[PDB]
Design a protein around this ligand. Structure first.
Ligand SMILES: Nc1ncnc2c1ncn2[C@@H]1O[C@H](COP(=O)(O)OP(=O)(O)OP(=O)(O)O)[C@@H](O)[C@H]1O
Ligand SMILES: Nc1ncnc2c1ncn2[C@@H]1O[C@H](COP(=O)(O)OP(=O)(O)OP(=O)(O)O)[C@@H](O)[C@H]1O
Ligand SMILES: Nc1ncnc2c1ncn2[C@@H]1O[C@H](COP(=O)(O)OP(=O)(O)OP(=O)(O)O)[C@@H](O)[C@H]1O
Ligand SMILES: Nc1ncnc2c1ncn2[C@@H]1O[C@H](COP(=O)(O)OP(=O)(O)OP(=O)(O)O)[C@@H](O)[C@H]1O
Ligand SMILES: Nc1ncnc2c1ncn2[C@@H]1O[C@H](COP(=O)(O)OP(=O)(O)OP(=O)(O)O)[C@@H](O)[C@H]1O
Ligand SMILES: [Mg+2]
Ligand SMILES: [Mg+2]
Ligand SMILES: [Mg+2]
Ligand SMILES: [Mg+2]
Ligand SMILES: [Mg+2]
Ligand SMILES: [Mg+2]
Lengths: 460, 458, 460
C-alpha cells in the first residue's frame, strides 16, 4: 500500500509514510479535537506541496465559515479555489455520484469529508449507518480516491465513533483525543488501524498553532567543550561541558541552581553566543534584580540581543504546549545554549509518563541542533543523592551537578559535587561553596566528615 | 478431539496443538486487533504447509482488498487463487449452501468468515443473531469443516462480541485485545473456551510483523570473559557461555563501561555481539566508548558489533521483545547487552516487564547467548534496590556498583553480589574509571556500613 | 432437606453434603466457566456411583458433540446410553411434559439441563422468562426431580443470569466465575443460595482437568525427626526437622536457599526416600550444573527414580493450577518430602488473598499426607528479619531458617539462624556460613558484633 505524504509535522513518521492511496481514513474525536484543521491541512499541503487536486465536502460549516477559520494559519483557500486547485462542496447516494463528478472534473487525488455523522440525523440505527457508510467508502475505492472521513465522539475513551460501526467499515482509523486530567487539557493522536500497512501504535502528544497541527513522535558526538561560566566548575568537569550535552543541576530550594544557570547564560553572551533562559519560577523582574546582585546584567545581555528570557507558569499550559514554545523560540533565536529553570516546576500536576516524553523531546531537540542544555530540578528530599536515584530524568541527562545543604557547627553550609559526567573525567570531591555578590566561590571538600550525603555530617 | 496446526508462531503451544478439527472457532476483538490477519494466516498456512484447501468468505472488504492487504506480509493469495488452492467468495441461508458448494467443489477443510457481525446489519435483537449464528455453526460442523469465525467488540473488557450471544454458540472462542494503557498499545491473545480439549488460559502478548502474527507463550560449565581481568578473577574465572548477568547501580556508576568492555571482548575474539541501547544515542556511545580506549566504529567495521538504538517508550514491550529475537536470529550474536532494563520498565506494569525479561532470558538461554543486562537502581543503597526487584532473582550473576562517600569524595565500589553455579569474590572492591576503563583496586577493610553508601571509619 | 452426594471433588464439602433432593439448582456463569462439564459430571458420578438414572437435556450442543467433548475426561456416555443409564434429549410446555416421560421411563433421579437461556430468543422480556422459568422449575418439584439448571452471564460480577430473574425462581444458585486479573485467569465456584439448608459461603478456587471439576474448599503430630541434609543445621534444629512439618528458608537473592533445598532433597534420596523438587526459578539444566558443582548428582537421584523435578513458570498458570499439579505429582510419585523453590516466584502477579489460600492448601496437604515440606522465599528487604515479620506465610510455617547477608571488613559474608522452631529447642545463634564445592559450612556466630539483623554490623 503506497502512502500519500500528508506533510503534517510528526504524522509522516507515525503513519510510516502517510495515508494509504485510494483508501478511506476515518478521523474521529470529540468537539474541538482539531478534526477540521487536520481535514483541511491534508488538502492544503497536498494542493500546495505536490499540485494535488483537493475536494472538501462540508456539512454543518459553510464554505465561507471554513475559508474564514483557516485564515488563523494564513491559508488562502479562496486563492486555491480561485486557481481551481480546491473544490468545496456545500451540503445519501446523490452526493456519492456528485463526489465522483468533481473527482473527474479536477483529476482529484485528495478528498476531506467534514463531518460524516451530521448526515445521520434521519437514521438513528447503527445498522442503517453501517450499510450507508459501507456504500460511501466502497464507492470511493472504486473511484480510487484518498479521502479523510471525519466523525464525532462523546467520550475520550468510549466508542471510536457515535454508532460504534464507522471504524470497522473504514480501512484506516486515526483517533484525535483532547483528554482532561487535573483541570489541564492534552491533545493526543493515535493511528488505531491502517489495513495492509504498518504504523507507530499508541497516542502521541500534539499542539494546534498558527502553523496548524504539530505532532511529536518519539553521527555527532563532539569532544568540543563549552564553559559553565564558573572556572573551578569547568576544572571539576575535567575541562568544562561538552557542546552537545544535557547538564542537570539538582538541589533543595535555595541551594543556588539559578546562580549556576545565570553564569551558564552569562558565559554564552560573554562569547557573543545567544542563549534562551526559559524561566518557570521567578518572573523577569525578580530574575534581573537577583542576576544584577550577583554582578551579571541580563538587561545588558538582552540589550546586545544575546539573551532571550521566556518565563511562563508551569501549569498555565500543557507540557506539549511548553515543548512547542521551546522548539519555536529555538528555531527563531537560534541559541548556542538554553536553560530550563526548572523541570520540577513543569513536572507538578503532570504524570511521569507525559513528563518523561517532554524531557526526551527537549533533550533530543537540544542534541539534534547541538545546543548545550542546563536544566534545573528542585529535589523533594533533603538528601540530594537519594532524589537523583529516585528520578528517570537524572539517568537521561549526560552531566549531573548535585547541590546539597550540609549542617556544620550550627551553620547551614552548602556543597557542590559533579555527581556524573558521561564521556569525561570529573572531580569526585564534595566541595564546600559560598554565594557572594560575585557568584559561586567553590572552595575545598570536607575531609574530616562522614555522612555528608545525609545533609547532617558527623566529625571523623 | 483432533487439533489442526495453524502454524501461527505461539498459537500451537497456547491452544495445545491448534484448533479443534471439524469445529467452529470464534475470533472476536476490537477494530485493528488483527482478526483479518489471523483468518487469512490460518488459510494461507493451511494451503502452503499441509496442502489444505481454503475458502475465505468476505463481506466488508473485496477480494482485491484482501490480496492487496495480505501482500504486506509477502503472501501471494492471487497466485494461490490461480492454482485453485484458495477461494475468495464475496458477499441468510442462501450463503450456507453457496459456501457448502464451494467447500465441496474444492474438497476444502479450512474456512475463514470475515466478518459474521457485518452481516447482521439488519437483525439485532440478539435472539435473531443467536438463532442465525446457531445455524452457521450447526451447518458447518454438519459438513465437518474447520472455520475461523471473525466478530467485532466495542470494549477491550466488555461483551465477547457485539450481541453477547456469539461465544455461547461457538465451540471455541479466541479474544483479540489491543489494550491502551499509559498511551501505549499492547496486543494480547486469549483462548476463552476450547470445548472438549485443554489450552493455556489468560492473555499472552503478540505483535504483527512482515511475517504476520507472532504470539509469545544442557547448562554447560563453559566460561567467557567480561572484558575485565580482575572482574573475571572475582567471578572465579569469568562468566558462563550461557547465563544472564545483571550490572546494577545508581546513575553514572559505570554500568555502560562494563557493557562496552563485555561487547569489546566478544569482538576481540572474532565473535559477534549486539548492544541494545535504550538511553544514550549511537553518536554518544561511540564518543564515550572511544574515550575509554575502545573503537566501536572498528567493531562495526569488522562486522562483529551491531548497535540497535530505540526509545524505551517508543513501542510496547511485546514489540521490543520481537525486535531483539529478529535481530538475534539475523546477526547470530555470541553475546548481547541490554542497556538498560530500567529504561524499558518506565511506565510499564511489573507484570508486563517480568514476562518480557523472562522471554529475553529464556531466548538468550535457548540459543545459548551470554546476556549482560544493566539496571539503574532507584535507591542510593544498591543492595536494597537488588532485593526490591523480582528481575534480580531471575538473573544468574549480579554485579552491584555502589557510590561510597570516602573523606569528602564520591568513590565507587564493585561487588560480585551473586553468582549461581560458581564461587565468586565476596569483597566490596573500590574501583576507578580512567581513559583505559575499570581499575578494580582493593576492598575498604577500615569501613563499616559501606552498603549504606556512607561508611563510618572502624 | 436431604442432599445428593454429587461426588465432584471439593463440592460435597462446600454444599454441606450435595444438592437438595427434588429441587432445581441454577448453575450460571460466563462462556467457558465449565457449566456443561459440571452438568455432565453431576449425572456421570450419580449413574456410575449410586446406579442413578440420569437425563441430560441439550439445546445448542448435539448429543454427539456432548458425548465427544466428555471423552477428554474418559467418560463413555455412549456406553451409559447403550446400557440405558443415560438419556440425552435433543432440543415451552411440550418439553416439560416430555421431561416427566423420560423420568418415569427410567425412574430418573438426576437431570442436567444445558442450557436454559438458549430457549429465550423468542422472548426478550424478563417477565415472560420469569413466568416460563417459574412453571418449568415448579413442575420439576411436582415430579420430585433433582435437576442442575444452566444459564449464561455477560459479566463476572453482574446479574446472576441474563434476565436477573433466574436466581429468585430457583431454590439453589451456584455461580461459576472465570475472573481475569493481571492477564491471568482464576476459576472460582460460589454457592450463593440453598433454600432450606446450609453451605460454605464465598468463592472457592477450582481447576478443570482429565478428572473434570476439582474444587479446593478451605491426630498426627509425630515427634519423629528427619534430617535437613546438613549436620550442624540438624544440631541447631535440636535434632533435625519433624517429619510432618513445613520449613521455610528465607533470605535475599543468592544467600543459598536452593543449596539448602538441594541437601534436603539429596538427604531424602540417600535414605531411599522419594522427593519432588518443584522448581519455579532456574530450569532443570542449570539446577543440575549447580547441584553437581556442590557435590550432588540429581541425574543419579533421577536415575534411581528417587527424585522428580517439576519446573514451571510462576506466571504461565494460575495459582490453583499449580496447587492441582503439586497434588497430582504427590498422589503419583508418593514422596517423603517436597521442596517448593520458590513461594515468592509463585506470589508475583498474585493477590495476598489468593496466595495465602494456595500456601494453606499445599501446607495442609503436605501435613495431611505426612510429607516434610521445605519452601523457599526470596525476601524483598536486605534485613531478612523485617521481611519475615511483614509476611503471613512466615507465621503459618512451623520452622523458619533465616539466610542473611552481613557486611564484615569490606566483605559480603552471609549468616544462618534457626529463627523459629515450633515444638522443639533450636540454637538461637546467628552463625556465619560459607558455600564451597561440598555445600554449606556453618561456622560460629559473631560475638563481637551489634546490629547483625540490619545486614551492616558495627564492632562491639
Ligand atoms: N490559530 C490557532 N491557534 C490556536 N488554536 C487554534 C487556532 N486555530 C484553531 N485552533 C484550535 O482549533 C480548534 C478547532 O479545530 P477544528 O475546527 O478542526 O475542530 P473540530 O474537531 O473539527 O471541531 P467540531 O468537531 O466541533 O466541528 C479550536 O478549539 C482552537 O483551539
Ligand atoms: N505489514 C505490516 N507490518 C506491520 N503491522 C502490520 C502490517 N500489516 C498490518 N499490520 C497491522 O495489522 C493491522 C491490520 O490487521 P487486520 O486488518 O487483520 O485487523 P482487523 O482486526 O481485521 O480490523 P477491522 O476490525 O478493522 O477489520 C494494522 O492496523 C497494523 O497495526
Ligand atoms: N481435558 C480438559 N483439560 C483441560 N480443560 C478442559 C478439558 N476439557 C474441557 N476443558 C475446559 O472446559 C471448558 C469448557 O467447559 P464447558 O463446556 O462445561 O463450558 P460451558 O461454560 O458449558 O461453555 P458454554 O457456556 O460456552 O457452553 C474449555 O474451555 C476447557 O478449558
Ligand atoms: N574518560 C573518562 N575518564 C575518567 N572517568 C570517566 C571517563 N568517562 C567516563 N568516566 C566516569 O564514568 C562515568 C560514566 O560511566 P557510565 O556512563 O558507564 O555509567 P552508567 O551508570 O551506565 O550511567 P547512566 O546512569 O547515565 O547510564 C562518568 O560519570 C565518570 O565518573
Ligand atoms: N560451586 C560453588 N562454590 C562456591 N560457592 C558457590 C558455588 N555455587 C554457588 N555458590 C554460592 O552460592 C550462591 C548461590 O546459591 P543459591 O543458588 O542456593 O542461592 P539462592 O538464594 O537460592 O539464589 P536465587 O535468589 O538466585 O534463587 C552464589 O551466589 C555463591 O555465593
Ligand atoms: Mg469540525
Ligand atoms: Mg532557582
Ligand atoms: Mg478486518
Ligand atoms: Mg549507563
Ligand atoms: Mg456449555
Ligand atoms: Mg535459589
Amino acid at each position: 500500500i503506497a502512502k500519500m505524504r500528508t506533510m503534517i509535522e510528526g504524522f509522516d513518521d507515525i503513519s510510516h509514510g502517510g495515508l494509504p492511496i485510494g483508501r478511506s481514513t476515518l478521523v474521529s474525536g470529540t468537539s474541538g479535537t482539531g478534526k477540521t484543521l487536520f481535514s483541511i491541512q491534508f488538502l492544503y499541503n497536498g494542493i500546495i506541496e505536490f499540485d494535488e487536486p483537493g475536494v472538501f465536502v462540508t456539512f454543518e460549516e459553510t464554505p465561507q465559515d471554513i475559508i474564514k477559520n483557516a485564515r488563523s494559519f494564513g491559508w488562502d483557500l479562496a486563492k486555491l479555489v480561485d486557481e481551481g486547485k480546491l473544490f468545496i462542496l456545500d451540503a445519501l447516494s446523490a452526493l456519492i455520484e456528485r463526489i465522483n463528478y468533481a473527482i473527474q472534473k479536477y483529476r482529484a487525488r485528495r478528498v476531506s469529508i467534514d463531518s460524516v455523522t451530521s448526515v445521520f440525523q434521519q437514521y438513528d440505527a447503527s445498522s442503517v449507518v453501517r450499510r450507508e457508510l459501507f456504500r460511501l467508502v466502497a464507492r470511493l475505492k472504486q473511484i480510487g480516491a484518498t479521502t479523510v472521513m471525519t466523525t464525532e465522539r462523546i467520550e475520550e475513551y468510549g466508542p471510536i465513533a457515535r454508532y460504534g460501526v464507522e471504524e470497522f467499515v473504514s480501512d484506516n482509523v486515526v483517533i484525535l483525543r483532547n483528554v482532561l486530567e487535573g483541570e489541564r487539557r492534552r491533545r493526543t493522536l493515535e493511528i488505531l488501524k491502517l489495513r495492509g500497512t504498518s504504523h507507530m501504535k499508541g497516542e502521541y502528544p500534539f499542539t494546534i498553532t498558527d502553523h496548524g497541527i504539530n505532532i511529536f513522535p518519539l553521527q555527532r558526538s563532539s569532544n568540543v567543550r563549552v564553559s559553565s561560566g564558573v572556572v573551578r566548575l569547568d576544572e571539576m568537569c575535567g575541562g568544562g561541558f561538552f557542546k552537545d550535552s544535557i547538564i542537570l543541576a539538582t538541589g533543595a530550594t535555595g541551594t543556588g541552581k539559578t546562580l549556576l544557570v545565570s553564569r551558564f547564560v552569562e558565559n554564552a553572551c560573554a562569547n557573543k553566543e545567544r542563549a534562551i533562559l526559559f524561566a518557570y519560577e521567578e518572573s523577569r523582574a525578580q530574575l534581573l534584580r537577583n542576576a544584577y546582585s550577583w554582578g551579571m546584567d541580563f538587561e545588558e545581555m538582552e540589550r546586545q540581543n544575546l539573551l532571550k528570557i521566556v518565563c511562563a507558569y508551569p501549569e498555565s499550559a500543557g507540557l506539549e504546549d511548553h515543548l512547542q514554545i521551546i522548539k519555536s523560540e529555538i528555531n527563531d533565536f537560534k541559541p548556542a545554549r538554553i536553560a530550563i529553570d526548572s523541570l520540577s516546576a513543569l513536572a507538578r500536576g503532570v504524570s511521569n509518563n507525559a513528563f518523561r516524553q517532554f524531557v526526551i523531546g527537549v533533550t533530543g531537540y537540544a542534541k539534534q541542533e547541538e545546543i548545550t542544555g542546563l536544566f534545573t530540578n528542585t529535589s523533594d528530599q533533603f538528601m540530594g543523592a537519594h532524589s537523583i536515584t529516585d528520578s528517570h530524568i537524572s539517568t537521561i541527562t549526560d552531566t549531573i551537578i548535585l547541590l546539597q545543604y550540609v549542617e556544620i557547627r550550627g551553620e547551614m553550609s552548602r556543597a557542590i559535587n559533579v555527581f556524573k559526567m558521561r564521556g569525561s573525567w570529573h572531580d569526585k570531591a564534595i566541595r564546600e561553596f559560598m554565594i557572594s555578590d560575585k557568584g559561586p566561590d567553590i572552595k575545598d571538600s570536607f575531609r574530616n566528615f562522614e555522612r555528608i550525603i545525609s545533609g547532617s555530617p558527623t566529625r571523623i
